[PDB]
Nucleic acid binder design. Structure first.
Lengths: 207, 989, 212
DNA sequence: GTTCGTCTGGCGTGCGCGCCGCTACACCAT
RNA sequence: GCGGCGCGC
DNA sequence: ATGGTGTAACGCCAGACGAAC
């Protein structure tokens, strides 16, 4: 149950959470979802294509973009990031493997607002492959798109069986209209963020 | 409890024994003993060291003082202490009363008189003085005289040392005096530690700027000599003042050498420093290694070891000389041990901290002393030549000493026409020293390891010293025989190869081309208006030209050194002393120019001693020429000989006009070897009596797929033995073609069965597709690697349907593995048996160890950072290493039994080379020993050995029972009769 | 002209007025095993100078959590300053064999940009800078061809010279100069180029950016 | 604290030797 | 030391 | 001609880690 989440957090600390922020980033966009302990999607948004991954790795631009991005996020008990399966052996994917780390660096430093005083980690890295295995999205040890499953969560309501996630009535219009407005574009971060939040609650909090 | 600082102090005291600086050691020891916190750091070995020093100088008073410090430590005197006291009493000619009281006090302490002469490190002068001291009180004290050396009683090595039999050991062609002179030239060369070789690159071009550059470099080198001398003496003064205090320093180590040798060494390292820089730590290791080495050289020079080695070697040459006889015919090792032998010892190296500190000290001194101006055209500003840069070398950042670009450009303009080699890098100019132990052999002054453990693995050597001496005798003799082979450079071949090399080169004949022939980019860049893609296209084109230029530079330098060594040895007779790897295969020690080299390297080499062709010498030379051409691989011997008689005219034309004739030799598989063979046959047929023509060319007899031959012999596999020419046949049997045919019939079976893969592979199952796979299976090819090889053999066909690589490669690797499961059932059973056995053995936390049928211990060094064994490389590496040890044993047996018949024998693992006059004999021995090797229960002895070795520890009983279960599950042999190998013509052909 | 060179050296671009109005800086240089910094004011007085040797980073693993722990504990020992200057190496996204270093440095440079810019979220003013190492070498004339040489001799000269009246380029406090000299002599036998290049980077920053 | 079980990920023909080299390229100015 | 190549079995 | 500066796809074992007594 700790093979997915790093660093190691006491299971009691995980089960006492009130709300989390699930963050998934790609090479051109980043998305996040705010879910509380009642599995209610308090927020779910993504920023348009950013200015990173333009051939150069300037730390000032990363600080500006990431700061402006996390400035729009509310406060939460834990911030979950994606830990990809990229290895230091794939020289073709070195541009990506660097980018993610830079992201993962600043998010670890900028979101742990109380780490300087109490030394308690609030930013985690959740294994993407294990999130795929949880939702049975694996095909040959490779994750497929969870777009159809998110579509089911968004448009299918009472499936004559217990729901896995809840959407507030004042926000379901914005969520579904966001889904349909971004259906033609590759927005796997938007889906995998919500799926990662649900997987976090089902695996770490309510087992 | 050994400590680093204790190591530094002990090395300080011993080094002071080397420099004869006794007052220094007494000063530091007294100061250390006088302080409370420093007295605890001292050890009995240090007091015994200074005690032995005062004993060698005959200082009774100081030795009594040291004894007082021993009892006041308060430690107790041991064997070395009483040895020092007795040595001082003997050297000073003391009365018998003090010596008697010493023997009675020694008897009261419980020490034995013989344990002193067996357990104490004393030189023959120290042993002589101690004996003279004992003979004053105990005059009838004699050390046990041990004279006879035991003869190996191994099953396979019994007849090699048994006195029953007519031996005709071969002697060299050189007389006694000439061999003694060659010994003098090799001794001078090793004492110099450097070899200067004339560079074969370009001819005599003095030029104008070169003269000025050489003058400037000479002046700078003299200035650096003065600066290095002054800084060296000042550093010795500083370290000496640090010894004046109660702290250890490297002063006596600097007092070990003639200083001028230190300056010349530093200037040599400065001249050989690469333009891009070196790791500071590695530079320190090099300076310390050379310092220690030259220290050993001067020590042997001044201790009389060189003179005693003269008296020993000159009497050893009586066995090898042509104009001298020996009392009884014997092997070189036997005669060498019968002469003396003193053997002596080598100074044990310093602790690693001492080495690092000395090396970094010398490097930093070289940085501080060497200076130069801004060069160009003296300068107002003067800067050093070497700089720290702190760059990134290999992943981790490291400090790199880098030369100034003016110094690099100065050396490039000077164009020094000479090359420098190490004394151990060039072949010996005299017959090497016979191997008598894993620590004494090969070169006369430089030590040579017996096994090729990479980077000082220390593991194997102790197990080489553990076994009984006789157990190694066999190997120790074989390595001598290969070393005593006298070689010479073929003048014609070297003249042609050089004529091509100095002009434009010829990569088609293995002659590297100069950088002038590198591909140029046509044309120069034309940026930037158009186009952004053309900048990257010309970028990649420039990258390709630079890649080809660099690789061409690599081959050009490698061949420059090899051909330069060949040229330096043109008018000289040289020897290649041999060595072993951890598994047991033999290799020459000079790596640049040797007969294990490429085609060009082989063609340049020929036997120094000739041999008359005899009745079949010329015919075997013709068969050997056809073999070198490779044009009649599949044909029997009779058709090879008839083919040679057919192309006799092209042979003679190729011999007469090599570069201007028909160039028939240039088309052969081994062009240069074919050329030299063509010259030999041409000279042979043009003699009045070809049967008397003296031939020097080595004839090869190679075993086709030797690994599969040893596997098939182990498993007694019938079909496999028929495939690798173990069964007698009128034509040579090709295993690759047979595997291709078996895979073909499987393809037809699955094609009629309905398999889609077999239908598209119709007409494409060829020998070249399965050649690399079948060949590399013996080395551990799995289904994945074999699938990749088959892929590599399917993509270039072009006439094959699109990709279809997955189905065809997977099905073809499954069918090749199955085909080998039918042809070599016992082979694959043995490979899996050894694999699983190594899996369990190494899983128990122990490396795999075994003993060859000749008594040679083999250990695998695969470990992971004591250090835990790397079980993966153990389990994957055990079978191939075992097979390699088997063919090594076969080769060594062939060498010994051929030596009993007076033949000149050299070997490339499975290629047996001898004179054309003796080929028929060698092939008769080569098979015989082979039959005698696998006739013994190799798998049974290995299984019982591993049971006694690894299934004996009563700790774990689970793995002892499962491992004892698998080890005792020896695969049953097949139906093949091994004796048939004696009648197989193409077993070695 | 001068502004263009000031754009090759300093990144990101900082207003020249605010840059010339600095009271004190911290020059930071980090490697694979150590990180060192020096706190110098506008009077060229070395208020502090130390290094956090022996860390648990590198050694095969790149854990962002451990990076946060180590870097946080390192910046806990740093005083407050007007600007934080880092070393900008000449490492490129090329040379595939040494990519592990280029990642490590970036991670450092990432978190140092995030943890030391304590006021960036509100005012958007950079307090962490990147100074080109090769240009610092050209400033001290430590360049040989295309490789920077060791600045140890310049630091030793700055430390052990009593004359050089007027413009000593650097000042050492009397209550701390003993500790600085004993530190230098305690690290003379080891290659600690980060310690030297940090102080040299501070002096070069003041001479090039502040007092031009 | 040690041992056992699981899982996840890396590897998949072996040993012996030898060269060389560790931002780059283009253009403008001296 | 790693990397680029080359060579023997 | 030379230097400086500006710009561009599978299966198997094993090693390690975590849990359990």
């Amino acid at each position: 149950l700790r093979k997915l989440l790093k660093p190691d957090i006491e299971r009691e600390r995980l089960k006492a959470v009130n709300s989390i922020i699930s963050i998934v980033f790609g090479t051109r966009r980043i998305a996040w979802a705010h879910l509380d302990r009642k599995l209610t999607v308090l927020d779910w948004q993504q920023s348009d294509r950013w200015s990173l991954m333009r051939g150069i790795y300037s730390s000032s631009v990363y600080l500006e973009e990431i700061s402006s991005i996390i400035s729009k996020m509310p406060k939460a008990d834990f911030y979950v990031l994606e830990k990809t399966g990229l290895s230091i052996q794939n020289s073709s994917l070195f541009p990506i493997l660097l980018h993610f780390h830079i992201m993962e660096a600043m998010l670890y430093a900028l979101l742990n607002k109380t780490f300087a005083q109490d030394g308690q980690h609030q930013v985690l890295s959740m294994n993407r492959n294990a999130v795929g295995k949880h939702f049975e999205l694996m095909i040959g040890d490779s994750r497929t798109s969870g777009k159809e499953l998110v579509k089911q969560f968004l448009f299918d309501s009472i499936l004559k069986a217990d729901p896995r996630v809840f959407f507030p009535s004042d926000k379901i219009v914005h969520y579904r209209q966001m889904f349909l407005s971004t259906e033609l574009q590759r927005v796997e971060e938007l889906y995998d963020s919500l799926l990662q939040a649900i997987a976090f609650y089902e695996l770490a909090v309510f087992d | 409890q050994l400590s680093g600082q204790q190591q530094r102090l002990l090395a300080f005291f011993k080094c002071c024994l080397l420099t004869d600086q006794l007052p220094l050691a007494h000063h530091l020891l007294v100061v250390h003993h006088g302080q409370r916190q420093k007295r605890k750091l001292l050890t009995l070995d240090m007091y015994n060291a200074v005690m032995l020093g005062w004993a060698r100088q005959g200082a009774f008073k100081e030795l009594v003082y040291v004894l007082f410090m021993v009892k006041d430590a308060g430690l107790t005197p041991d064997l070395l202490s009483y040895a020092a006291a007795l040595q001082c009493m003997g050297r000073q000619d003391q009365d018998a009363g003090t010596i008697e009281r010493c023997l009675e006090q020694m008897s009261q302490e419980g020490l034995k008189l013989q344990a002193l002469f067996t357990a104490v490190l004393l030189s023959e002068e120290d042993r002589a003085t101690v004996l003279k001291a004992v003979h004053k009180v105990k005059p009838t004290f004699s050390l046990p005289p041990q004279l006879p050396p035991p003869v190996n009683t191994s099953k396979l090595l019994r007849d090699v040392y048994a006195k029953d039999g007519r031996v005709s050991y071969p002697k060299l062609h050189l007389p006694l005096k000439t061999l003694q002179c060659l010994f003098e030239k090799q001794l001078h060369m090793e004492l110099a530690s450097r070899v200067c070789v004339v560079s074969v690159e370009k001819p005599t071009l003095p030029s104008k700027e070169v003269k000025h550059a050489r003058k400037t470099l000479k002046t700078l080198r003299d200035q650096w000599e003065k600066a290095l001398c002054r800084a060296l003496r000042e550093t010795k003064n500083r370290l000496e003042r640090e010894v004046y205090e109660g702290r250890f320093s490297l002063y006596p180590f600097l007092c070990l050498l003639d200083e001028r040798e230190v300056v010349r060494m530093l200037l040599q390292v400065l001249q050989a420093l690469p333009a891009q820089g070196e790791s500071f730590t590695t530079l320190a290791r090099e300076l310390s290694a050379r310092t220690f080495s030259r220290h050993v050289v001067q020590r042997q020079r001044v201790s009389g070891q060189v003179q005693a080695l003269q008296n020993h070697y000159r009497k050893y040459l009586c066995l090898l000389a042509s104009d001298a006889e020996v009392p009884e015919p014997c092997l070189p090792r036997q005669y060498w041990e019968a002469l003396g032998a003193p053997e002596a010892l080598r100074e044990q190296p310093w602790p690693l901290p001492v080495q690092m500190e000395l090396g970094k000290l010398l490097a930093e001194m070289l940085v501080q002393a060497t200076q130069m101006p801004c060069s160009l055209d003296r300068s107002s500003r003067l800067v050093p030549v070497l700089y720290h840069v702190y760059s990134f070398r290999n992943v981790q950042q490291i400090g790199i000493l880098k030369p100034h670009p003016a110094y690099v450009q100065l050396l490039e303009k000077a164009a020094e026409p000479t090359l420098t080699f190490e004394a151990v890098d060039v072949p010996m100019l005299c017959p090497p020293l016979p191997w008598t132990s894993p620590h004494s052999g090969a070169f006369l002054l430089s030590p040579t390891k017996l096994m090729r453990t990479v980077e000082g693995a220390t593991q194997h050597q102790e197990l080489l010293e553990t076994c009984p001496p006789t157990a190694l005798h066999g190997a120790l003799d074989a390595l001598t025989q290969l070393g005593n082979c006298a070689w010479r450079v073929n003048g014609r071949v070297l003249d042609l190869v050089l004529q091509l090399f100095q002009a434009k080169g010829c990569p088609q004949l293995g002659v590297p081309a100069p950088p002038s022939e590198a591909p140029q980019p046509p044309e120069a860049h034309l940026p930037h208006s158009a186009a952004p893609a053309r900048k990257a296209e010309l970028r990649r084109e420039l990258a390709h030209c630079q890649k080809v230029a660099r690789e061409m530079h690599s081959l050009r330098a490698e061949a420059l050194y090899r051909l330069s060594l060949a040229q330096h040895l043109r008018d000289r007779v040289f020897w290649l002393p041999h060595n072993m790897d951890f598994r047991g295969r033999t290799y020459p020690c000079p790596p640049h120019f040797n007969h294990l080299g490429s085609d060009v390297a082989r063609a340049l080499l020929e036997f120094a001693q000739g041999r008359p062709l005899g009745p079949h010498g010329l015919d075997w030379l013709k068969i050997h020429l056809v073999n070198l051409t490779g044009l009649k691989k599949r044909e029997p011997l009779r058709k090879r000989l008839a083919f040679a008689e057919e192309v006799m005219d092209d042979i003679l034309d190729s011999a007469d006009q090599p570069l201007t004739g028909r160039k028939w030799w240039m088309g052969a598989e081994e062009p240069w070897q074919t050329l030299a063979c063509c010259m030999e046959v041409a000279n042979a047929v043009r003699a009045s009596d070809p049967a008397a023509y003296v031939s020097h060319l080595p004839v090869h007899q190679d075993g086709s797929c030797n690994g599969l031959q040893h596997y098939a012999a182990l498993g007694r596999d019938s079909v496999g033995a028929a495939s690798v020419n173990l069964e007698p046949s009128d034509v040579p049997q090709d295993v690759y073609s047979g595997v291709a045919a078996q895979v073909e019939v499987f393809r037809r079976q699955d094609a009629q069965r309905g398999m889609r893969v077999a239908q598209v592979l119709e007409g494409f199952i060829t020998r070249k597709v399965v050649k690399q796979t079948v060949m590399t299976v013996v080395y551990g090819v799995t289904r994945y690697g074999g699938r990749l090889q088959i892929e590599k053999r399917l993509r270039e066909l072009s006439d094959f349907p699109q990709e279809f690589v997955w189905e065809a490669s997977h099905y073809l690797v499954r069918q090749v593995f199955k085909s080998l499961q039918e042809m070599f059932s016992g082979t694959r059973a043995i490979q899996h048996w050894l694999t699983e056995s190594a899996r369990l053995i190494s899983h128990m936390g122990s490396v795999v160890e075994w003993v060859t049928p000749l008594g040679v211990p083999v250990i695998q060094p695969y470990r992971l950072d004591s250090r835990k064994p790397n079980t993966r490389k153990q389990k994957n590496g055990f079978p191939p290493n075992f097979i390699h040890s088997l063919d090594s044993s076969h080769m060594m047996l062939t060498a010994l039994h051929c030596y009993r018949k007076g033949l000149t024998f050299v070997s490339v693992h499975d290629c047996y080379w001898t004179h054309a006059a003796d080929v028929s004999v060698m092939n008769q021995v080569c098979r015989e020993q082979f039959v005698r090797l696998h006739s013994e229960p190799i798998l049974q002895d290995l299984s019982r050995f591993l049971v006694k070795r690894f299934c004996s520890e009563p700790q774990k009983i689970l793995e002892a029972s499962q491992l004892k279960e698998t080890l005792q599950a020896v695969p049953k042999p097949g139906a093949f009769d091994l004796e048939q190998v004696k009648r197989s013509t193409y077993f070695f052909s």
